[PDB]
Amino acid sequence: TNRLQDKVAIITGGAGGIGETTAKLFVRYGAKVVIADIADDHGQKVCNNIGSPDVISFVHCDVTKDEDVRNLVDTTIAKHGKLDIMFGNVGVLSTTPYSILEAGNEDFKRVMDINVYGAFLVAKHAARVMIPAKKGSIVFTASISSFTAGEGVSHVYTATKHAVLGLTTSLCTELGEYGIRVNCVSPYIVASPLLTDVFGVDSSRVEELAHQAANLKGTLLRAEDVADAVAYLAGDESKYVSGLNLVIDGGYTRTNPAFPTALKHGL
Amino acid sequence: TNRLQDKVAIITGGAGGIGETTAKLFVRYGAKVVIADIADDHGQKVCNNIGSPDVISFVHCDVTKDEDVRNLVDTTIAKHGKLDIMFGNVGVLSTTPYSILEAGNEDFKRVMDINVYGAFLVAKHAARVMIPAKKGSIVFTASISSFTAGEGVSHVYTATKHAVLGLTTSLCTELGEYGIRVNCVSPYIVASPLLTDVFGVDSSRVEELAHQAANLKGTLLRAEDVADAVAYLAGDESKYVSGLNLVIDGGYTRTNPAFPTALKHGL
Amino acid sequence: TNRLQDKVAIITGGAGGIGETTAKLFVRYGAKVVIADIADDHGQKVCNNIGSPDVISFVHCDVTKDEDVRNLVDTTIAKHGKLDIMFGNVGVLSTTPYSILEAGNEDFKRVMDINVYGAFLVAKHAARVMIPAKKGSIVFTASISSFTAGEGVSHVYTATKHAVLGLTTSLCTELGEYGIRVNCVSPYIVASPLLTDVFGVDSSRVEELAHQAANLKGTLLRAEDVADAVAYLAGDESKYVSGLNLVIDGGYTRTNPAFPTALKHGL
Amino acid sequence: TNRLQDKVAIITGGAGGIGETTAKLFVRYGAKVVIADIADDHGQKVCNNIGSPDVISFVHCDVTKDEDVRNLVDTTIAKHGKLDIMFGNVGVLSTTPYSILEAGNEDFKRVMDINVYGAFLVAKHAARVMIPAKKGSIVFTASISSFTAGEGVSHVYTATKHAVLGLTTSLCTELGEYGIRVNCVSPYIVASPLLTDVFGVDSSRVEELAHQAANLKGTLLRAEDVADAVAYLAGDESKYVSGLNLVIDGGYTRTNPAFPTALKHGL
Ligand SMILES: NC(=O)c1ccc[n+]([C@@H]2O[C@H](COP(=O)([O-])OP(=O)([O-])OC[C@H]3O[C@@H](n4cnc5c(N)[nH+]cnc54)[C@H](O)[C@@H]3O)[C@@H](O)[C@H]2O)c1
Ligand SMILES: NC(=O)c1ccc[n+]([C@@H]2O[C@H](COP(=O)([O-])OP(=O)([O-])OC[C@H]3O[C@@H](n4cnc5c(N)[nH+]cnc54)[C@H](O)[C@@H]3O)[C@@H](O)[C@H]2O)c1
Ligand SMILES: NC(=O)c1ccc[n+]([C@@H]2O[C@H](COP(=O)([O-])OP(=O)([O-])OC[C@H]3O[C@@H](n4cnc5c(N)[nH+]cnc54)[C@H](O)[C@@H]3O)[C@@H](O)[C@H]2O)c1
Ligand SMILES: NC(=O)c1ccc[n+]([C@@H]2O[C@H](COP(=O)([O-])OP(=O)([O-])OC[C@H]3O[C@@H](n4cnc5c(N)[nH+]cnc54)[C@H](O)[C@@H]3O)[C@@H](O)[C@H]2O)c1
C-alpha cells in the first residue's frame, strides 16, 4: 500500500544519490515531496522524472545559507499546507588529503558549513513549523563515522558527521518534549553510477570493494537500503523511537580483524 | 498490505504482553507464527484468539532448557517448511530487592538462566536452521538498561539485559558473514492490563508515571510500538541493518535533569 | 615525587580555571609549562604566580586563528627544546538561549570557531612537532555533553563538545600509528570563585547544586579533580591508553531518575 | 614516592599475569596486598616473591563460590583493619570453539560462573565492607570485548566481559551514592611468558602479532601497562571518576581497515 500516506516531506539533498531513491520511495509510499538542492539541472531532472509536481517539486537551496533554508520551508507550507517530515541528508567530504599535517585549514570551514552548521538551519526551519503542530520526525543522515573512524576519512568529516549526532541527541531533548522525533540514519559505502576523478573510483569497482570488506557477504548496500531506514524513522512506525542512529553497516563497525586476520590459524 | 508475507517467525515469549501484539502484527502482516511459551493456558488463549493455527500455533518451551529449545525449532521446520525470523523476547526481572548488600545470591543464577544463557540457545537453534539457507534476522529484545541504569532496576537485570547485546554484536560478527542479520530491540515502560503485587503497580498508574517521566510528552508507549520496531528489523526493510539496538525510549536515555531541574531559573 | 618530570607542556586555556590548577599540578609534577590564553592580564598573573618562568611562561594566543596557534608552538620549541604534551582545553559556551527556534544563527559560527575548528589547529601545530619525535599525548577537554545532553546546554555546545571527540578518535587513528596518543578528558560542573551575570550564578550556589544533583554524594568536583584525569593521560602512566574520553561525572551520565524518583515507593 | 600509601587492596586473580604486576605495583606504591587465587602453588610463589607478608599474603579463593569470597574479605579486615580497594580481575575464556552451531552448551555456564556471576560476589563482599566506611573504588577488569567483537573471541566471553560493565555502570549507580567508586579497566593482547597448547601460541609470537595488528606502532602492551590504568582508578587520583571503562587498546577499537586496506591507492 502507500504506507506514509498523507505526509509532506522535504529532502535537503535529493538530486544526487541517496536523496532521490529516498524521494521516489516516499512518493511511492504516498507522500508529497519537495526535493531541494543547489544542483539545479539534476534536482529537477529527478523531480521531472519520478512523478508529476503536485507530488514532486524542486527548490534551489544552499544550506550554507539562512535566507535559503527560510525559503524552502516557507514555500512547502505554501505548496502543501504543512511539514510532517524533514529528511536532512546534505553532505560533503574533503577536497584536501587526510593527514593532519598536510591536509589544510579552510576545507574545515567550508565542510563544517555544509555538514554541521548547515544541518542546523534545516532543523531550525523545520522545528519552527513542526512545533506549531506538535507533530514530526526530523531525520538527518550521518555516516558510520558518526560512531567511529578510518585511515581514509578526513578528521573534518569524522568531526562534522559526529556532531550531526550532536544536534540529534540534543535537538532530541527538546524537540521531543513536543512529540516531535529527532533521529538520524548512518550508512556505509553506497552510490556508484560508475564514478572517477582520480581512478580507483570508477564505481562498481567501489561496490565490489564494499563486499570483500563488509561483515555481510550475501548482499550489497544501495540507496533503497538507506531509504528503508528512512521511511521507518519517517512518520509511521517511528512513533516512539526518537532514540536512534540507525547504523547500517551490515554489522561492520563492531569488529577489527587486524588481530584475527593476522591470528588466523594453520599454514 | 501484508508486508512480511511469506515469513515464518517464532516468538520465544508471545503469551504475555509485547510478544502477542508483536505476534498479531506479524500475522496481520502475513507471516505464520509459532508463539512459544511455558505459560500454557495463556499462550494458546492467545494462539486460539489471534488467528487459525495454520498461521498461529503454541509450543511449550522453557528457554532455561536445551531439549526444549531443540523442540520448537525442529517442529517449526515440520509445521511450516522453514525459519526466516526468530524474535527472541524472553524476560524476567528480580524477585529480590536491588541493593547489592541485601539483594541475594541465587536470583542471579535463575535470572541469568532465563535472560542471558537462555537467550543463547534460541540463537543456536535458529542459527543452525537459518545458516543452511543463508537467510534470516534474529531479533532479540533487551531493555534501555542494555545501554544504561537505574536506582530501581537490579544489578542482575542491568547485567543480563546488557549481555543480550553481547551475543547480538558478537553473534552478529559471524551470523552476518552468512547474510543473516543479528539485532535487538530495546524498550522502556510498556505493559499494563492493570497490575499489582505490592501496590504502586495497579497498571495504568505505571503508564501515567511513564509520561511525567519520559522525554516525549504527547504519546504513550505500548506493545504496538515495540512490534513496530520488530517487524522493521524482521525480514523486510531490515535488509542491510544488522547494526542496531533500536532504543525506544522517546529519547529519555540521553539526558539527566538532576542538575537542570535543580538549576531551573526563577522563583 | 615530581612525576612527569622532564615534560614540556602547553595549556591552550590556563588562565581561567581548570587550566591553571592543571598547570600548577604539571609544574608541581616537574614539567615546564607555557600557559596560553587571550586573557592577558589573568594568564600572566597566573604565570607570575605559580612559579618562575623557566618553568612558567604566558603567550597570547587566539585559537580562533592559525598564525596564533603557529606562534605558541614555534616559541615553545624555542623556549624549551621540544613539545611532549598539549593539553587543549579551550571552551566557550552560548550567549544566546537554548531553544532551537529562539536561539540564533551566529553564536554557532563563533562557538564552533573557539571549540571545534579551533581545537583542530592546536592538534595540527602540536601534531607537526610531535610527529618529528615519534612521542606525545594530545589531551583535549570536552564535557559530559561529549557523550549526551541537557535542557540547559545549547544545541551548539552539545554539537561542538561532541566533535572534540571527533578529531580525538579520528585524530587518534593516525597520530597513533606514530606512538603519539590522542585522548580527551570530559568533566561535569566544576569552577566557582563565586560567579554571576544573571543571578542563580553566584558560585558556590552552583557547587551546592552539583551535590543535590550528582551520583556521588560524599565529595565535590574541582579543578584538582580534572588535573588528576589530565596528568594521567599526560605522558606517564598514559603509555598505551590512547582510547579514552575519561568521563568524570562521579557516575551521573548513566542514569535518569525521572522514572525512579517518580516511581519512589511508599507514602 | 609510594603513591597510594595506606591502602589495603585485594586482587581476585593475582597469581597469573596482569594480577601480579598490578600487585607488585600496588606494593611498590605503598599498599598492602592480599593476592587471592585458586592456583595455590603460583599465587604464593608470587606472594613469597614480591615482598614480605605484612604487605603481601595469599588466600585460596574460588569466585565460582560464596563461602569463598566471604573468606578473603573477612580475613583481609582481620589481617589489616580495612578494605579500601578491590581490584577484581578474574577471567576465563572458552574451551570450546567460537562457532554458534559447533561450540557448546556448558562452557557458557562455567564461563559465566567465573566471569559474570562470580565478578558479582567480589563486589558484594567488598560492597558490604566499603559501605560501612563510605570510601572505596571497586575496579574490575574487562576486555575490549566489553565494548565490541571478533572472529576469534567466543560469543560467551563477548557476552560475559560485556556484563562486567553491567554491574559496573549499575553497581555504580548505587555504590556511588556512598562516595564509593565503580570502574573497570578493559585491555587488549597482553601476557606471554612464551605460551602454547595448540601452536601459534608460543608467546612472543602472540606479542609480535599484537604490533602488526594494533593502532600504535612504537610500543607493546604489557601488564605494567594495565597496572597503570589500575592504580589510577585505585584510590588516589581516581577521586571523582566513577565513569570509566578505561579502554587500553592504543586506539585499535575505533577503526576497521577492511575497507581502507582494500581501498589502498596505487599499484
Ligand atoms: N557512499 C555513500 O553514499 C555514503 C556513505 C556514508 C554516508 N553517506 C552520507 O549521505 C549523504 C550524501 O548523499 P549521497 O547520496 O551519498 O551523495 P551526493 O550525491 O553528494 O548527494 C547529496 C547532495 O548534496 C548536494 N549539496 C551539496 N551541498 C549542498 C548545499 N549546500 N545545499 C544543497 N545541496 C547540496 C550535492 O550536490 C548532492 O546533490 C551525506 O550526509 C553523507 O554523509 C553517504
Ligand atoms: N515494560 C515492559 O514491557 C518492558 C520494559 C523494558 C524491557 N522489556 C523487555 O521485554 C521482555 C518481557 O516481555 P513483556 O511483554 O514485557 O513481559 P511478560 O508479560 O513477562 O512477557 C514475556 C513472557 O516470558 C515468559 N517466560 C518466562 N520465562 C520463560 C521461559 N523460561 N520460557 C518461555 N517463556 C517464559 C513469561 O511467562 C511471559 O509470557 C523482556 O525481554 C524485557 O527485558 C519490557
Ligand atoms: N564547570 C566547568 O568548569 C566545566 C564543565 C564541563 C566542561 N568544561 C570544559 O572545560 C573547558 C573550559 O575551561 P573552564 O576552566 O571551565 O573555563 P574558563 O574559565 O572559561 O577557562 C578557559 C579559558 O579559555 C579562554 N579563551 C576563550 N577563548 C579563547 C581563545 N579563542 N583563545 C585562547 N583562550 C581563550 C577563556 O578566557 C579562559 O581563560 C571547556 O573545554 C569546557 O568545555 C568545564
Ligand atoms: N591478553 C591478556 O592478558 C588479556 C586480554 C584482554 C583482557 N584480559 C582480562 O584480564 C583478566 C585475565 O588475567 P590475565 O593475567 O590475562 O590471565 P591469567 O593468567 O588467567 O590470570 C588470571 C587468574 O585467574 C585465575 N582463576 C581462574 N578462575 C579462578 C577462580 N574461579 N577463582 C580465583 N582465581 C581464578 C587463574 O588461575 C589466573 O591465576 C580477565 O578478566 C581477562 O578478561 C586479559
CATH number at residue B91: 3.40.50.720
Sheet of strand B56-57, all strands in order from the earlier edge strand to the far edge: B56-57, B32-34, B8-11, B85-87
Ligand 4, pocket residues at CB < 6 Å? D 13, 15-19, 37-39, 61-64, 89-92, 114, 141, 143, 161, 187, 189-191
Angle at D265 between CA D263 and CA D266, to 5 degrees: 135
CA–CA separation, A91 and A190 (whole Å): 13
CA–CA separation, D229 and D206 (whole Å): 22
User: Would you say A221 and A249 are in contact if contact means Cβ atoms under 8 Å apart?
Assistant: no
The HSE-up count of residue D12 (CA atoms within 13 Å, CB side) is 33
Q: Which residues of B156-174 are buried (b: 16+ CB within 10 A; e: fewer)?
A: bbbbbbbbbbbbbbbbbbb
Amino acid present at B23: A
Interchain pair A177, B216: CB under 8 A: yes
Which chains neighbour D (Cβ–Cβ under 8 Å, 3 or more pairs)? Answer: A, B, C
- Determine whether the shortest distance from the Cβ of B226 to ligand 2 is under 6 A: no
The HSE-up count of residue A42 (CA atoms within 13 Å, CB side) is 10
Of D207, D205, D202, D241, nearest to D223 by C-alpha is D207
- Catalytic residue chosen out of the listed positions A29, A157, A188, A232: A157
CA–CA separation, B240 and B243 (whole Å): 9
What domain range includes position C80? 1-267
User: Would you say B182 and A250 are in contact if contact means Cβ atoms under 8 Å apart?
Assistant: no
State in Å: Cα B172 to ligand 4 middle: 26
3-state secondary structure chain D: CCCCCCCEEEECCCCCCHHHHHHHHHCCCCCEEECCCCCCCCCHHHHCCCCCCCCEECCCCCCCCHHHHHHHHHHHHHHCCCCCEEECCCCCCCCCCCCCCCCCCCCCCHHHHCCCCCHHHHHHHHHHHHHHHCCEEEECCCCCCCCCCCCCCCCCHHHHHHHCCHHHCCCCCCCCCCCEEEEEEECCCCCCCCCCCCCCCCCCCCCCCCCCCCCCCCCCCCCHHHHHHHHHHCCCCCCCCCCCEEECCCCHHHCCCCCHHHHCCCC
C-alpha cell at position A96 = 584536501
CA–CA separation, B16 and A171 (whole Å): 36
What resolution in angstroms does the PDB record give?
Answer: 2.8
CA–CA separation, C235 and B178 (whole Å): 45
A contacts of D151 (beta carbons < 8 Å): 255, 257, 260-261
CA–CA separation, B253 and B245 (whole Å): 13
C-alpha cell at position C20 = 591553571
- Taking chain D, what is the end-to-end CA distance rounded to the nearest angstrom? 55
Torsion angle defined by CA atoms of residues B173, B174, B175 and B179, in that order, rounded to the nearest 10 degrees: 90
What number of residues does chain C have?
267
Q: Residue D114 CA: which ligand 4 atom is closest?
A: 31
3-state secondary structure D139-152: ECCCCCCCCCCCCC
Residue C112 at interface with chain A, using a CB cutoff of 8 Å:
yes
Residue A258 at interface with chain D, using a CB cutoff of 8 Å:
yes
Q: What is the number of structural domains in chain A?
A: 1
User: Would you say C24 and C48 are in contact if contact means Cβ atoms under 8 Å apart?
Assistant: no
SS3 C126: helix
List, in order, residues 6 or more apart from A183 with CB less than 8 Å away: A137, A138, A139, A140, A168, A172, A233, A238, A241, A242, A243, A244, A245, A246
Q: Angle A119-130/A66-79 helices, nearest 10 degrees?
A: 40
List, in order, residues 6 or more apart from B26 with CB less than 8 Å away: B4, B7, B9, B11, B33, B85, B87, B227, B231, B234
State residue B169 phi and psi, 5-degree precision: -130, -35
Interchain pair B256, C256: CB under 8 A: yes
List, in order, residues 6 or more apart from D56 with CB less than 8 Å away: D23, D27, D32, D33, D34, D35, D47, D50
Cell 542491568 found at: B158
Q: Residue A115 CA: which ligand 1 atom is closest?
A: 41
Q: Which residues of A211-250 are buried (b: 16+ CB within 10 A; e: fewer)?
A: bebbbbebebbbbebbbbbbbbbbbbbbbbbbbbbbbbbb
The annotation status of A18 as a binding-site residue, yes or no, is yes
Q: Angle B66-79/B119-130 helices, nearest 10 degrees?
A: 40
Nearest chain B residue (CA) to A248:
B241
Of C38, C25, C199, nearest to C113 by C-alpha is C38
CA–CA separation, C205 and D99 (whole Å): 57
**Residue B15: nearest ligand to its CA?**
2
Angle at D47 between CA D41 and CA D49, to 5 degrees: 100
The annotation status of D82 as a binding-site residue, yes or no, is no
Known catalytic membership, residue B157: yes
User: Would you say D162 and D149 are in contact if contact means Cβ atoms under 8 Å apart?
Assistant: no
Q: Residue B19 CA: which ligand 2 atom is closest?
A: 15
Least CB–CB distance from B213: residue in C150, C252, C262: C262
State residue C137 phi and psi, 5-degree precision: -100, 130
Of C260, B155, B107, B95, nearest to D170 by C-alpha is B155
State residue C112 phi and psi, 5-degree precision: -145, -40
Residue D262: Cβ within 10 Å count: 13
Q: Angle A18-26/A224-233 helices, nearest 10 degrees?
A: 50
CA–CA separation, C182 and D250 (whole Å): 9
Question: What DSSP assignment string belongs to C180-223?
Answer: EEEEEEE--S---SS--SSSS-STTTTTSTTTSSSS-TT----S
State in Å: Cα B13 to ligand 1 middle: 42
Q: Which residues pair with B136 in a beta bridge?
A: B180
The HSE-up count of residue D78 (CA atoms within 13 Å, CB side) is 7
Which chains neighbour A (Cβ–Cβ under 8 Å, 3 or more pairs)? Answer: B, C, D
Please identify every residue of D annotated as catalytic: 157
C-alpha cell at position A67 = 535566507
Query: Pocket of ligand 1, candidates A24, A143, A160, A220: which has the most ligand atoms within 8 Å of its Cβ, to mutate?
Result: A143
C-alpha cell at position C124 = 595540527
